[PDB]
Design an enzyme around this catalytic site. Structure first.
Site, PDB file in Angstrom:
ATOM      1  N   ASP A 124       9.996  17.559   8.852  1.00 58.01           N
ATOM      2  CA  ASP A 124       9.950  16.814   7.602  1.00 58.01           C
ATOM      3  C   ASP A 124       8.536  16.508   7.192  1.00 58.01           C
ATOM      4  O   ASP A 124       8.309  15.479   6.573  1.00 58.01           O
ATOM      5  CB  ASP A 124      10.732  15.498   7.755  1.00 58.01           C
ATOM      6  CG  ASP A 124      11.018  14.812   6.415  1.00 58.01           C
ATOM      7  OD1 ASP A 124      11.601  15.464   5.513  1.00 58.01           O
ATOM      8  OD2 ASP A 124      10.648  13.619   6.285  1.00 58.01           O
ATOM      9  N   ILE A 142       8.930  -0.418   4.115  1.00 55.35           N
ATOM     10  CA  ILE A 142       7.891  -0.743   3.096  1.00 55.35           C
ATOM     11  C   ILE A 142       6.643  -1.211   3.805  1.00 55.35           C
ATOM     12  O   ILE A 142       6.738  -1.732   4.931  1.00 55.35           O
ATOM     13  CB  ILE A 142       8.334  -1.878   2.173  1.00 55.35           C
ATOM     14  CG1 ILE A 142       9.788  -1.650   1.717  1.00 55.35           C
ATOM     15  CG2 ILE A 142       7.368  -2.048   0.997  1.00 55.35           C
ATOM     16  CD1 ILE A 142      10.086  -0.265   1.172  1.00 55.35           C
ATOM     17  N   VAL A 143       5.478  -0.980   3.193  1.00 56.74           N
ATOM     18  CA  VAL A 143       4.246  -1.095   3.955  1.00 56.74           C
ATOM     19  C   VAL A 143       3.191  -1.902   3.235  1.00 56.74           C
ATOM     20  O   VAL A 143       2.925  -1.669   2.057  1.00 56.74           O
ATOM     21  CB  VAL A 143       3.694   0.302   4.341  1.00 56.74           C
ATOM     22  CG1 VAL A 143       2.669   0.182   5.436  1.00 56.74           C
ATOM     23  CG2 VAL A 143       4.834   1.186   4.810  1.00 56.74           C
ATOM     24  N   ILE A 159       0.800  -1.216   0.000  1.00 55.06           N
ATOM     25  CA  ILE A 159       0.000   0.000   0.000  1.00 55.06           C
ATOM     26  C   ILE A 159       0.843   1.281   0.000  1.00 55.06           C
ATOM     27  O   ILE A 159       0.296   2.375   0.141  1.00 55.06           O
ATOM     28  CB  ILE A 159      -0.958   0.041   1.221  1.00 55.06           C
ATOM     29  CG1 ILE A 159      -0.202  -0.219   2.553  1.00 55.06           C
ATOM     30  CG2 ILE A 159      -2.121  -0.924   1.023  1.00 55.06           C
ATOM     31  CD1 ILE A 159      -1.034   0.119   3.778  1.00 55.06           C
ATOM     32  N   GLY A 160       2.153   1.149  -0.211  1.00 56.77           N
ATOM     33  CA  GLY A 160       3.117   2.256  -0.067  1.00 56.77           C
ATOM     34  C   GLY A 160       4.533   1.846   0.374  1.00 56.77           C
ATOM     35  O   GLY A 160       4.783   0.721   0.862  1.00 56.77           O
ATOM     36  N   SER A 161       5.461   2.780   0.184  1.00 55.52           N
ATOM     37  CA  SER A 161       6.826   2.658   0.668  1.00 55.52           C
ATOM     38  C   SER A 161       7.354   4.045   1.027  1.00 55.52           C
ATOM     39  O   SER A 161       6.890   5.049   0.494  1.00 55.52           O
ATOM     40  CB  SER A 161       7.703   2.028  -0.392  1.00 55.52           C
ATOM     41  OG  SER A 161       7.687   2.815  -1.560  1.00 55.52           O
ATOM     42  N   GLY A 162       8.299   4.084   1.957  1.00 56.45           N
ATOM     43  CA  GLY A 162       9.085   5.288   2.281  1.00 56.45           C
ATOM     44  C   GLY A 162      10.525   4.836   2.356  1.00 56.45           C
ATOM     45  O   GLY A 162      10.803   3.699   2.044  1.00 56.45           O
ATOM     46  N   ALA A 163      11.442   5.708   2.773  1.00 55.40           N
ATOM     47  CA  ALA A 163      12.875   5.318   2.897  1.00 55.40           C
ATOM     48  C   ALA A 163      13.066   4.367   4.082  1.00 55.40           C
ATOM     49  O   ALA A 163      13.682   3.327   3.962  1.00 55.40           O
ATOM     50  CB  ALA A 163      13.777   6.549   3.043  1.00 55.40           C
TER      51      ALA A 163
HETATM   52  C1  LIG Z   1       5.699   5.862   3.712  1.00 50.59           C
HETATM   53  S1  LIG Z   1       4.063   5.369   3.109  1.00 50.59           S
HETATM   54  C2  LIG Z   1       3.181   4.650   4.486  1.00 50.59           C
HETATM   55  N1  LIG Z   1       3.740   4.162   5.562  1.00 50.59           N
HETATM   56  C3  LIG Z   1       2.786   3.724   6.359  1.00 50.59           C
HETATM   57  C4  LIG Z   1       3.067   3.069   7.705  1.00 50.59           C
HETATM   58  C5  LIG Z   1       1.568   3.959   5.707  1.00 50.59           C
HETATM   59  C6  LIG Z   1       0.258   3.702   6.121  1.00 50.59           C
HETATM   60  C7  LIG Z   1      -0.098   3.614   7.455  1.00 50.59           C
HETATM   61  C8  LIG Z   1      -1.400   3.379   7.798  1.00 50.59           C
HETATM   62  N2  LIG Z   1      -2.327   3.258   6.866  1.00 50.59           N
HETATM   63  C9  LIG Z   1      -2.063   3.364   5.585  1.00 50.59           C
HETATM   64  N3  LIG Z   1      -3.205   3.220   4.695  1.00 50.59           N
HETATM   65  C10 LIG Z   1      -3.169   3.461   3.276  1.00 50.59           C
HETATM   66  C11 LIG Z   1      -2.546   4.574   2.717  1.00 50.59           C
HETATM   67  C12 LIG Z   1      -2.542   4.750   1.339  1.00 50.59           C
HETATM   68  C13 LIG Z   1      -3.199   3.818   0.504  1.00 50.59           C
HETATM   69  N4  LIG Z   1      -3.203   3.996  -0.953  1.00 50.59           N
HETATM   70  C14 LIG Z   1      -3.691   2.867  -1.806  1.00 50.59           C
HETATM   71  C15 LIG Z   1      -3.578   3.032  -3.313  1.00 50.59           C
HETATM   72  O1  LIG Z   1      -2.308   3.478  -3.660  1.00 50.59           O
HETATM   73  C16 LIG Z   1      -2.000   4.711  -3.114  1.00 50.59           C
HETATM   74  C17 LIG Z   1      -2.052   4.697  -1.580  1.00 50.59           C
HETATM   75  C18 LIG Z   1      -3.841   2.714   1.091  1.00 50.59           C
HETATM   76  C19 LIG Z   1      -3.820   2.541   2.464  1.00 50.59           C
HETATM   77  C20 LIG Z   1      -0.754   3.586   5.159  1.00 50.59           C
HETATM   78  N5  LIG Z   1       1.877   4.557   4.560  1.00 50.59           N
END
Ligand SMILES: CSc1nc(C)c(-c2ccnc(Nc3ccc(N4CCOCC4)cc3)c2)[nH]1
Length: 325
Positions: free
Chosen positions: A144, A32-33, A25-29
């Site tokens: 940040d 990964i998530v 559902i996402g990544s950062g540095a």
């Molecule tokens: C560095 S990125 C990141 N780190 C964490 C721990 C999260 C996080 C934490 C808690 N909930 C979510 N829920 C969530 C965010 C976005 C999406 N989208 C689904 C389609 O594609 C674009 C995003 C889906 C679900 C995301 N995001």
């Protein structure tokens, strides 16, 4: 066995069997998530893997920071930790950490792309400011904040994902120029996000630091010469002996055409929004609005009612104990 492995992006997540159907559902540095179904609690969760927390000092300090603050911080506008685990059985084997938090529905980048709605923007900004205030009250200045580390539920509840400290688009002038900061550094970042909700463009793009600085002064104007005296000696020659930019007024930076129109309601909200922008997007931090004054601003107030250094071994031990505790 209590664990199983699943391939996620380029990597392998090894998780408790309660956590099912992992999808990215996402990544950062920082790591990964995945979204997952927690069958024990019977709800969905987000799962972040820290791979190389104890690889080096930089990674270890931030992993340790993130872990301790995620456990010690409880506020509605900060993401809550639900579980922490490692699949390794002893200190000697210890490699990875997994953070399990509540699942939100979208990133702020997606909400920023939606049409401008005053009650939503006002609400989102209130919540961001509430989160920021609470971090500051605990001694954490973020520095940040950006759309990619903020998430929202479909009901517009907002959550900051992390505790902060290149592409420096959201970083305050004082941070870019390395000139020391205080709490209102986070107000700049809120101003950048607010302007972006209005314009649907990153306010201050840049190939690098130089162009980043250029784009800020292009828009806001070269600041008062008193500001420059606080700059480390060569930073100062650059800034001071560049060309004087008269920037643009806030009605020109954010015209009527960007905002809902042709009612007095919308006319009031447009000028409240621009008024707030003009107080946040202020290069000199000594003239930039505080968190408390921003909460009281009429656009927003409708919603009221250590650092010590360690060896690698030691960081590993500190992290391990934080996980096992
Ligand atoms: C560095 S990125 C990141 N780190 C964490 C721990 C999260 C996080 C934490 C808690 N909930 C979510 N829920 C969530 C965010 C976005 C999406 N989208 C689904 C389609 O594609 C674009 C995003 C889906 C679900 C995301 N995001």
């Amino acid at each position: 066995n209590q664990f199983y492995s699943v391939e996620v992006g380029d990597s392998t997540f090894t998780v408790l069997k309660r956590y099912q159907n992992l999808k990215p559902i996402g990544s950062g540095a920082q790591g990964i998530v995945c979204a997952a179904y927690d069958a024990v609690l019977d709800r969905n969760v987000a799962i972040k893997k820290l791979s190389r927390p104890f690889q080096n000092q930089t990674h270890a300090k931030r992993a340790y920071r993130e872990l301790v603050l995620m456990k010690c911080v409880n506020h509605k506008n900060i993401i809550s930790l639900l579980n922490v685990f490692t699949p390794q059985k002893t200190l000697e084997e210890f490699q990875d950490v997994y953070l399990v938090m509540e699942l939100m529905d979208a990133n702020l980048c997606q909400v920023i792309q939606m049409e401008l709605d005053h009650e939503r923007m006002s609400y989102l900004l209130y919540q961001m400011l509430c989160g920021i205030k609470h971090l500051h009250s605990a001694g954490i200045i973020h520095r940040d904040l950006k759309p990619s580390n903020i998430v929202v539920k479909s009901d517009c509840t907002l959550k900051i994902l992390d505790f902060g400290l290149v592409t420096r688009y959201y970083r305050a002038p004082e941070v870019i120029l390395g000139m020391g900061y205080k709490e209102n550094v986070d107000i700049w970042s809120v101003g950048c996000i607010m302007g972006e909700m209005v314009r649907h463009k990153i306010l201050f793009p840049g190939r690098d630091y130089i162009d980043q600085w250029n784009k800020v002064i292009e828009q806001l104007g070269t600041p008062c010469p008193e500001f420059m005296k606080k700059l480390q000696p060569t930073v100062r020659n650059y800034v001071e002996n560049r060309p004087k930019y008269a920037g643009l007024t806030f009605p020109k930076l954010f015209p009527d055409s960007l905002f809902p129109a042709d009612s007095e309601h919308n006319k009031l909200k447009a000028s409240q929004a621009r008024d707030l922008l003009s107080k946040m997007l202020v290069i000199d931090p000594a003239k930039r609005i505080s968190v408390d004054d921003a909460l009281q601003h009429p656009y927003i107030n409708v919603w009221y009612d250590d650092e010590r250094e360690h060896t690698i071994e030691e960081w590993k031990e500190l992290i391990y104990k934080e996980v096992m505790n």
